[model samples]
Target: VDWHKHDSKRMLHAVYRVGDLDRTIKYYTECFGMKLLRKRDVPDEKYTNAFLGFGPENTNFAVELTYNYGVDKYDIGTGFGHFAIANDDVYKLAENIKSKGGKITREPGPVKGGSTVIAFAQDPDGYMFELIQRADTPEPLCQVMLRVGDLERSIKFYEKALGMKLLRKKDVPDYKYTIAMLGYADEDKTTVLELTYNYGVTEYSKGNAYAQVAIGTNDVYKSAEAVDLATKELGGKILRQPGPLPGINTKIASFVDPDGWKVVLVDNTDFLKELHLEHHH
Candidate 1:
């Protein structure tokens, strides 16, 4: 099950369903230290997808945000939660969000019941991205968020079944959500699983069309099994059985999240597990 294959190129690409591609691009490049990877307009289709990323590495995950001209709002759905990033100084970074006129959705502080330092802010299109403090050079695609119908159930499943280390959990009154952090912590930085529970809101339309965050790991089958087992505990199903990706030898699989979000687990060849300590400086 150690289907970790090296990517031909060292690059990461994250696709987001945005209402305004142009605005999101501005916010990311101007505020979050990302730059344009590519940009194209499809007037015939009435939409456009712009790609961006943090680092210069080819395998360094890129951010792809899409904007459809006719869409104005999306239901804060249950499946796809939020995008996350790691920062050396979460407080100062959050200040940067505020300085850029981005409202502070959640103030920087300890996650409830966990030790991880985290903060939250809303993008121009109302999407939320979290900031967690990491002691290393922030990798391109840090992590993606998932939503849950019951916070306690998701927490138990992630911690006990998947063997994920519970970093922290906390409530942000201003943002109307409770965030629980799970998964491994590498050196000063690592990928994180953020379970978001927005108080008083349960049912979300989740939009008709969107892609869940794809996570890369050392072992795809192992990670997929973890998610499958966790979902089974919550009475969910694994949408795709674990297997090698088509046209590629790497392993890949997906699962139905508690709130219907689709999560694809990838055995990333481009991931540098040995480089975990590379950013320790």
Candidate 2:
């Protein structure tokens, strides 16, 4: 089936738990050039949420970090991989991050077997971020990587269910792993999901840190149906039926892939209106 009905889909934001909100927020803002868009303290619920990104939440993909009171650590299991930031110059950016106390695990340089410059850094809460040197790109929050058991199945799920394009796939036998990138547009112009399959590994622990990624769709119901169809053959289930959220009134549907990774689909038109209303309030 042509899933083009869900063609308006775009990666929204990634949700994850952080132990020290202030510490990580500072790191993201100062070292990564992300702006603190907004924050909410749910005292009664004993938790807090902060949204950060390189631009407005309504137009740009962002990072949603949650913090529970008194919790100071989390196990970043092997399942979740690093987030990527595409920039103009990775070497200078890495130096800036290093000067700001950020841990640079990989120094900025060209890839071992390629010419793409890249660097790796860790946040205060142990979340890793990859910096890629690109002369120009429309989105800075460009990539979110996750490990999966079967790369082809994961790629099919994103393409069939989410209406994404299989941009590229690479297998490195020496590294004993393979990678498949899928997204709505080119990897340089839009956010993409990088699914990696390690040789001979089927499962990985999902720690409490990383959560689901939110995507914007034109029609939640149609998107849900696409997800349902894909899951029937592949392996995932619809977590939430398409409908308005109880309190927020935003139309959304949630689902999980074969690898047990979750993704939430939100109504695109409603999201723009909702975010506009939210910004004015």
Candidate 3:
């Protein structure tokens, strides 16, 4: 595979599908101080879209929320994890959420391996959102979770091959599962990945309809090589190889964890840099 080069100065915007558009928009706007970038409707589908920005020029890392009626519940399947955000005063912010009748899945504490304080809460639809205590400075991005089928293979791939640190492990006594967070912590502590294993769950049949998680990489070929080697060593499998996006010149690739959930790692730094916009273009 040819090594793809990407411009280092770029930001990523994440989009999400949700059931409540106005409710979520309101929550984000008031709680996170995000502004609604744009609110419009999809004429064909009659669905609505509201783009949100955390700060100015949030289009660089905006969240796209779609409200499609009749779809109140999402399977989310397995292997998909929650989105994370950083809070300088996470405890206070979490308390606020609790005061508003929000549910806290996990309390604020130093994550197993690192000293960073973190907590977990759920949105109206049971979606997981993590709050990480951050530096007094602004955080570029925090952490995100991904689900995989095989825990052993993912551990070897991320820990041994990718060289990410194994922070710590926590067992949810009531949930019958354990969670492990792996990755380095820094300004862009955003790269951390979470692997979850449910007791007595070895395999599951993934429905055809599901969304995939995207990971940004510095070098596509090197990242692919590392993951490939780890997969072979751990008896993992690849869903797709690093290649150009279909009908587009952008580089993207897909892989599967021990579970059937799909993860796509893409080299999009250059693309995002070229297209990064303060306002939607």
Candidate 4:
């Protein structure tokens, strides 16, 4: 272990069960500029599904939805905040939602006294979304923006996961959160941001402690098997099975690491789709 060798993979997406698949998906597609990538049904478990994304599953972060077949709705939690979108137009997107007779709770405008434009949008369901204006937007997951040091050794991004380079950067110069690339150095697969803070700031304290990193695996089942083989000493347990979950089609598996911290494992076409397109071999 002297080399401290690294293995490989990347983020898949977060999970949630939206009560009405079409209700949210429609709002996301029309108002959020998403594409309806795939959908399916299972008779044995009684399920309907939809997976939406800005692009293909392999390269972009996608929402895999579990349809409530017998059930009608889900009461969303207050503890969970709204999902935001990075887009070029906040005003037009507000109109895009309003034009469809949807909700934009707050009008498109500046953030309080700040110049950066943002707006609020809601769907038929209770879920809320914030629209952020950006010169470059991916229309992917509401990015998990982290505050890294102005100078530190925590450059796990620039250094590994098969070397995610500066995928270019996003801006407002010194005032706002900026996107500095941290992925396979491309758009086809999902990317991360350094979101550099102030000039002299070193380390930022935890508003919320860092928990987990979810990666897309070819087979989460295999991950459990391999993890099982190694975890025999470190010791962990499988939290759930690796197959079609509750009528939803996305296959997922979870296991705790030796440190009691958890690493998540999920699936295929989405990750390969991350590998798709004009990316050089």
List per-prediction Cα lDDT, in the order shown.
0.66, 0.90, 0.62, 0.58
In model 4, the clashing pairs are: 58-270, 58-273, 58-274, 59-273, 59-274, 164-183
TM-scores, one per candidate: 0.61, 0.95, 0.65, 0.60
After best superposition, candidate 3 residue 21: deviation in angstroms?
3.3
Model 2 spans > 4 angstroms off? none
Model 1, span 174-200: residue lDDT tens: 778888877655423545667888887
User: Which order, best to worst by TM-score?
Assistant: 2, 3, 1, 4
Query: Which scores better on TM-score, 3 or 4?
Result: 3
Superior candidate under TM-score, 2 versus 3: 2
> Which candidate should be chosen as best, given TM-score against the real structure?
2
Error of 1 at 22 (Å): 3.4
What is the per-residue lDDT of model 3 for residues 157-202, given as tens digits with 9 covering 90 to 100? 6664445656767778676887777764433443356777787777
Judge candidate 1 against the unseen true structure and give its global Cα lDDT, from 0 to 1: 0.66
* Winner by lDDT between candidate 3 and candidate 1: 1
Error of 2 at 239 (Å): 1.4
Q: Candidate 3, overall lDDT? A: 0.62
Spell out the clash pairs found in candidate 2: none
Backbone clash total, candidate 1: 13
